[PDB]
Amino acid sequence: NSYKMDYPEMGLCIIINNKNFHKSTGMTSRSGTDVDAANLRETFRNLKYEVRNKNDLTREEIVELMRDVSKEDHSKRSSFVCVLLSHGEEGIIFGTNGPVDLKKITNFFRGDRCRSLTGKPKLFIIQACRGTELDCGIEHKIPVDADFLYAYSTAPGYYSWRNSKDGSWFIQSLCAMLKQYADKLEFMHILTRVNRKVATEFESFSFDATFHAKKQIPCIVSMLTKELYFYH
Amino acid sequence: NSYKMDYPEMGLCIIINNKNFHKSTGMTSRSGTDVDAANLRETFRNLKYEVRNKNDLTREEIVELMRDVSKEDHSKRSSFVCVLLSHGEEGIIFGTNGPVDLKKITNFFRGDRCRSLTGKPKLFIIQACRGTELDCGIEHKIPVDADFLYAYSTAPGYYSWRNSKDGSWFIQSLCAMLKQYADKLEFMHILTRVNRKVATEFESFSFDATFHAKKQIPCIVSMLTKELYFYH
Incomplete structure (x- = not known):
C-alpha cells in the first residue's frame, strides 16, 4: 500500500513561474512569485528531485513543455512533480499570453499516454485562482486517470x-x-497540516474592505492508489 | 492535529437513496442501489453514527432536508456525514424530479451557517456520475469552506x-x-485503499463494446485541517 520510491531517481520537478503577462491580457504582475519559485526549487532539491525552473512561459510554450516532458523516459524515476504558479480561473491556468485548460496539461501524463510513469505518482501543485470568490471566514488494468494528485x-x-x-x-x-x-509523514498527512496552517495562520489585510479579513483553505484532490513517502 | 472525536455522539449519517425517478425526467431506475443504502446503514451503525435513511426524494425534499439538518444543534456531535446515492452530472445530483446543485447542498453546512459544526469534520460521500466520460484503462478565524471532505x-x-x-x-x-x-487507519489512508480497490478489482463487462472493459478511480477532495479517526 505504499508507492515504490526506491527507483534510481526520485523524478522531475517542473516549476512554471509566470510573473509578467503580455499587456494584451490585462493581467497584472504577480509580485513576489519569485520567492515561491526559489522556495520550491530548494525544498524539492532537498527531496532529491531533478528541478527545472521555467519563467514567463506562453500558453503554447507551457503546452509544448508538458508534451516534451511526457515524451521522456521516466523508467528510472519514482515519480513526477509539476508546480504551476500564475493567474487562473476554475479549471485553467494562465500562460503569458492567454489561458490554458488544466486538463490539457495533465492529459499528457495519463496512464496510457506516458507509459514510463504508469503506476507512479503524478503530482500537480497549483498555486492559481480558481475563481474570484472570497472566503469571509468565521468564529488486469488500472484507470488512465489513476495515480494523480492535485494539490490546489x-x-x-x-x-x-x-x-x-x-x-x-x-x-x-x-x-x-x-x-x-x-x-x-505520508504525503496526504503533510498536506493536511498545510491545510490547517493556511487556514489558521493567514488572513488578508486591505484598506479596501472588500478584500480585508479574508481567509483561505487549500484543496487536496487525490486519485492516488497508495501512500506516498518521500523516502525509502 | 487530530479531530476531537470524543464528543457524546459521533454524529448524524444522512443517507439519501434515490432509486426511482419521475417519468418526466427520462432517468432510468438505479437497480441494486438498495444494497448500497443497506450496506452504508450497517457500516456506519458500527461506527456509532446516528443513521437516517431517506428514499426517493425530490429535488425540493433534498434541499429542505439538508436545510432542517443544518438547523439542528450538533453541539454534542463529533461530526457529520451525508451519503448521496443517485444519478448525477459534474457538480450536481439528481432528485426524483430534477437536478440539484451540489454546492447548494453543502452550503447549508458552511462554517458560518452551521455554528454547531464549526471546526468539526463534515463528510459528503457522493455515489453519482460526474459526466458521461468512460475510462478505458491501461496496461482568529477559519475559512467557512474549511473542514469539509468530499469523497467522490x-x-x-x-x-x-x-x-x-x-x-x-x-x-x-x-x-x-x-x-x-x-x-x-486515518480516514485519508482508508480512502486511499478504497481508490486502489476500485481501481484494481473492478472492470466493466458489456455486450456493448462501448461500455465494455472500462475502469474507474474515485476522487478524494479534502478541505480538512486535521487527521480523522473514527475512534477515541
Whole structure:
C-alpha cells in the first residue's frame, strides 16, 4: 500500500513561474512569485528531485513543455512533480499570453499516454485562482486517470492569496511542512497540516474592505492508489 | 492535529437513496442501489453514527432536508456525514424530479451557517456520475469552506459504475475498507485503499463494446485541517 520510491531517481520537478503577462491580457504582475519559485526549487532539491525552473512561459510554450516532458523516459524515476504558479480561473491556468485548460496539461501524463510513469505518482501543485470568490471566514488494468494528485492552493471557485513579500500563502506553508515532515509523514498527512496552517495562520489585510479579513483553505484532490513517502 | 472525536455522539449519517425517478425526467431506475443504502446503514451503525435513511426524494425534499439538518444543534456531535446515492452530472445530483446543485447542498453546512459544526469534520460521500466520460484503462478565524471532505465515487467528468447485484463499485469498497480499517487507519489512508480497490478489482463487462472493459478511480477532495479517526 505504499508507492515504490526506491527507483534510481526520485523524478522531475517542473516549476512554471509566470510573473509578467503580455499587456494584451490585462493581467497584472504577480509580485513576489519569485520567492515561491526559489522556495520550491530548494525544498524539492532537498527531496532529491531533478528541478527545472521555467519563467514567463506562453500558453503554447507551457503546452509544448508538458508534451516534451511526457515524451521522456521516466523508467528510472519514482515519480513526477509539476508546480504551476500564475493567474487562473476554475479549471485553467494562465500562460503569458492567454489561458490554458488544466486538463490539457495533465492529459499528457495519463496512464496510457506516458507509459514510463504508469503506476507512479503524478503530482500537480497549483498555486492559481480558481475563481474570484472570497472566503469571509468565521468564529488486469488500472484507470488512465489513476495515480494523480492535485494539490490546489484554494477551494473550487475561490481566489488564491499571495504575499508580495513572503510568497503565496499556500506555497509558503507547503514548503515549510515538507521541510519539517517529509522524512516522516505520508504525503496526504503533510498536506493536511498545510491545510490547517493556511487556514489558521493567514488572513488578508486591505484598506479596501472588500478584500480585508479574508481567509483561505487549500484543496487536496487525490486519485492516488497508495501512500506516498518521500523516502525509502 | 487530530479531530476531537470524543464528543457524546459521533454524529448524524444522512443517507439519501434515490432509486426511482419521475417519468418526466427520462432517468432510468438505479437497480441494486438498495444494497448500497443497506450496506452504508450497517457500516456506519458500527461506527456509532446516528443513521437516517431517506428514499426517493425530490429535488425540493433534498434541499429542505439538508436545510432542517443544518438547523439542528450538533453541539454534542463529533461530526457529520451525508451519503448521496443517485444519478448525477459534474457538480450536481439528481432528485426524483430534477437536478440539484451540489454546492447548494453543502452550503447549508458552511462554517458560518452551521455554528454547531464549526471546526468539526463534515463528510459528503457522493455515489453519482460526474459526466458521461468512460475510462478505458491501461496496461482568529477559519475559512467557512474549511473542514469539509468530499469523497467522490469517480473523477471529474466521469461516469460512476454500479453492479445491479452487489451495489456500486465505490460504496462496496468504501464499506469493506471502513469495516476492516476504521479501528486503525486515518480516514485519508482508508480512502486511499478504497481508490486502489476500485481501481484494481473492478472492470466493466458489456455486450456493448462501448461500455465494455472500462475502469474507474474515485476522487478524494479534502478541505480538512486535521487527521480523522473514527475512534477515541
